[PDB]
Amino acid sequence: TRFEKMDNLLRDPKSEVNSDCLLDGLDALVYDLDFPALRKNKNIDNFLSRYKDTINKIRDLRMKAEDYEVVKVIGRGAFGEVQLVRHKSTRKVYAMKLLSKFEMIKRSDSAFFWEERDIMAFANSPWVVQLFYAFQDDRYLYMVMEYMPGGDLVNLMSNYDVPEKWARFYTAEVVLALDAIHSMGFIHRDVKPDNMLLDKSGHLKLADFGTCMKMNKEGMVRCDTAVGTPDYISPEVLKSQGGDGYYGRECDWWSVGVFLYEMLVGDTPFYTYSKIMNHKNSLTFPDDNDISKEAKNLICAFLTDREVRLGRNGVEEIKRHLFFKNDQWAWETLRDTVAPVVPDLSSDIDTSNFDDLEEDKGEEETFPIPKAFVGNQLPFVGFTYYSN
Amino acid sequence: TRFEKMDNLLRDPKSEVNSDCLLDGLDALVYDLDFPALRKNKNIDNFLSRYKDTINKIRDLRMKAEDYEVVKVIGRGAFGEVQLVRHKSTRKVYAMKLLSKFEMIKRSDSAFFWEERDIMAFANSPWVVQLFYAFQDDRYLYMVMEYMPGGDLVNLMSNYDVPEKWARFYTAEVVLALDAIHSMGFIHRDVKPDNMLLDKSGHLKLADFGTCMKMNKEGMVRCDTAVGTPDYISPEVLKSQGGDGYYGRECDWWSVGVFLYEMLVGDTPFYTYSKIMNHKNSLTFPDDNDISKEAKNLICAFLTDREVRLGRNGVEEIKRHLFFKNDQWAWETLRDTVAPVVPDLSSDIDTSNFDDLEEDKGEEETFPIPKAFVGNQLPFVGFTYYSN
Numbered sequence A, B: 001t002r003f004e005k006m007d008n009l010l011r012d013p014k015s016e017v018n019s020d021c022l023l024d025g026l027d028a029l030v031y032d033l034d035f036p037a038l039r040k041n042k043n044i045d046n047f048l049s050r051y052k053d054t055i056n057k058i059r060d061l062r063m064k065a066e067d068y069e070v071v072k073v074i075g076r077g078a079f080g081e082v083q084l085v086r087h088k089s090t091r092k093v094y095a096m097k098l099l100s101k102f103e104m105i106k107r108s109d110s111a112f113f114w115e116e117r118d119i120m121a122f123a124n125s126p127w128v129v130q131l132f133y134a135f136q137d138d139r140y141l142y143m144v145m146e147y148m149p150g151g152d153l154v155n156l157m158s159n160y161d162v163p164e165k166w167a168r169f170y171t172a173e174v175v176l177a178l179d180a181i182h183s184m185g186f187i188h189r190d191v192k193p194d195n196m197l198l199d200k201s202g203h204l205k206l207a208d209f210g211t212c213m214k215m216n217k218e219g220m221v222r223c224d225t226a227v228g229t230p231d232y233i234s235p236e237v238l239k240s241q242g243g244d245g246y247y248g249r250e251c252d253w254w255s256v257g258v259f260l261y262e263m264l265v266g267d268t269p270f271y272t273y274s275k276i277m278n279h280k281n282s283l284t285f286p287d288d289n290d291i292s293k294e295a296k297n298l299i300c301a302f303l304t305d306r307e308v309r310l311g312r313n314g315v316e317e318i319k320r321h322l323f324f325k326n327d328q329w330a331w332e333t334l335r336d337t338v339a340p341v342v343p344d345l346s347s348d349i350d351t352s353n354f355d356d357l358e359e360d361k362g363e364e365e366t367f368p369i370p371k372a373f374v375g376n377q378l379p380f381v382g383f384t385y386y387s388n
């Protein structure tokens, strides 16, 4: 019967109307209706009276910020911050990304986090940072992810004189990790060393997918907006980013070329937002460099106009490049080899590979008590995810 | 863990936050927010866009009025009406009680149907009419119950010269059926021949429980209001029905005394709303009657002041009365004996034992399109029940 069908929708962790998402919808109404000015409506107060006891019982069973003890703030900026936390119950230590609902609403747009949530939750790849539980209170969205103790690629590049042997590895892992996102039907529209994190064994995993989009059946993310950093931007998604356009998988691979270039040159290839259009002309290596001919070959293969750019005819095109030819590892067993930098850590709460951002110390800014129905928690309905 | 606990709440058909009730909450928001005047809110439109496709897919899987083909209107009045219907799919024929959400809201109070729903759904008794599915659209509450082809006790009394043998049986079944409701922690506050329906074999079952309440741990339904018919009202819940009072189980048994009296006398015992206070003085039988001394004995046993009234010291007190002593049946096997009037029916859609109330033929009055948030479907959140 139809009850067999409607039962998949209730179970399916991917479904926006699964029991946890459904619960969010009800929890939203209590948050958005329990105001003196609004309670004057008969319908509003009858419902609030009927349900307030129940939702508050639920709120104490369901995952809440109080279940974790905040250790340090390992990251910050762009609406929220990331904290190294520990589960009070299981004693397991994770990285949790708090995201301000007030700022997210005030500064408009409250729909970027959807792909960040779906990718980390349903990637099922050793190349993507795993989201265990997504939950929320009246002030924040919460994302509990596996802690990447190794830190990010920005500080690795800044603390070492990165040899070619290392760039060969890190680029390879970025290629595999980036391919996993492509398989999932997503296009990053912004790949950076900031999003490249290292696990306990020194291996790469991608994180922070706020800049993503699901590609149409044609194989393109048809957009007429300039979303991304001004150095990792492709000439494809720059010339038609406000005058009829539809970006693709190609533009993502351009960023890998910028990454490998930065790793070996110690600066960005193009540097008040052009030279990327003239990409042929302006691309130069510091003469004379120790950079191998194959490192330069692959860099140009990526930093070229869309139509001929490497990665248009699949992933294997890249995997086959001579730059990756090495005696130490193979694509199939890459994640099983010893990484160039394996973090020598002390405790399960060691943040040495992370910049010291002080433990918050501020005033939690909040939304105001309304007179009319607002629905401020409305957009965050369906954000809760539990990996059961 | 706490997820084991919160999982019972999601399954439990009695729970107001079970998946079907949860779904209602979301379905309510779409009904109550999809208005041009309201859509102007950003939060409202983002949510409506995100969910409108899904809820409409759900609305076509979930039980809806269109799943049944209306045959006849077997009953009516007091906000709704009852129709003999057939399941288009299973071809099973039921009685469905449509209840106007507009009138229920307009004339205030939209919380009487809760006990009517819980009693019929969770009675699990051959003495109570079974509710299979409770569902709802934007205009009505729906109650699908097993059809009682035998009709009600009002027309039985009016079509026959009811002998003592019959009153012995009908009163016995009313006593058992009424005890089932008492076990469930409810007090009818209005028992009538209108609520007494007969199954296909001519046996009694109680229906229409709008006038109910759940009794406190003391064993009383502490009320200071006069809810009930002016002839079946007890002196206990009349003298203290607007001047400090707390009614009980006793007042329900008074109505059984009125019923047995009506069955044998052909009129009501008290008949511009007194004589019930003077219950001793005014109680008289039409001299001289053919009514047996035991029939009169039991009638007085019920129609007396609370403090001494039969039924105060349990059900067995009543079951033990000599009026019930008979050679034909016993309390334990009463429902297994041949009933006084077994309906000789033609088809599975025969309504001969029901008054002919024309097939509606009118204008469906509706709520108005609002400018501000109303929440008209708010009270009906949690009404949906499926006996899976």
Ligand SMILES: COc1cc(C(=O)N[C@H](CO)c2ccccc2)ccc1-c1cn[nH]c1
Pocket (backbone or CB within 6 Å): A074, A075, A076, A077, A078, A079, A080, A081, A082, A095, A097, A129, A145, A146, A147, A148, A149, A194, A197, A207, A208, A209
């Ligand atoms: C610092 O660690 C992280 C940071 C991020 C991340 O997305 N950070 C950026 C800023 O860099 C951000 C954006 C928006 C709001 C807040 C923060 C994602 C995962 C981790 C992490 C570390 N271990 N496991 C997971």
Ligand SMILES: COc1cc(C(=O)N[C@H](CO)c2ccccc2)ccc1-c1cn[nH]c1
Pocket (backbone or CB within 6 Å): B074, B075, B076, B077, B078, B079, B080, B081, B082, B095, B097, B129, B145, B146, B147, B148, B149, B194, B197, B207, B208, B209
């Ligand atoms: C006529 O049949 C019924 C009537 C009722 C019932 O409650 N009727 C009253 C009016 O009499 C009413 C009150 C409020 C709104 C509408 C109707 C309840 C069950 C049946 C029935 C018949 N077979 N199975 C179930």
